[PDB]
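Margin note from the TA: students keep mixing up input and output lines. Inputs are the sequences; the output is the structure of the whole complex. Example:
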Amino acid sequence: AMYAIAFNLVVVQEAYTDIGAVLAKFGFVRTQGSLYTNMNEDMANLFQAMNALKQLAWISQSVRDIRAFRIEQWSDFTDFIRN
Amino acid sequence: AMYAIAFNLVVQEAYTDIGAVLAKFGFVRTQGSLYTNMNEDMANLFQAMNALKQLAWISQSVRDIRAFRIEQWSDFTDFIRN
């Protein structure tokens, strides 16, 4: 299924870099904003991504809000908008 | 259900004007350039997208725009902030 991670930071580009690096290790790529998606893997993979983030000592003081969710009915409106 | 709109722009700026149109159909910016509405249906999302479409300049200045349903919305803030 399609899993997604979205967050709010308080820190910038470096933190976004280091978080993106941890998430890339589990197939989560920045798609549209501060939204990281993985269209392939399951919940165990999402949970390993979230454990890997926890490991980063500084993330608890830089992340205000972090959401993970399943995306369904992923739909492209780019053409619907470009007329 | 929970619906969301995510986009990539090229040219806070006109995030204001898109956000204003989307706020009219209950879509609020929640986490980045991600606008969410927990409440309404596909018809509401549809007229939100028509409302964007009518903006003259949005064709030049949107590269990618997705809409989708969110399920299993989960809060990992406590999970992380330990």
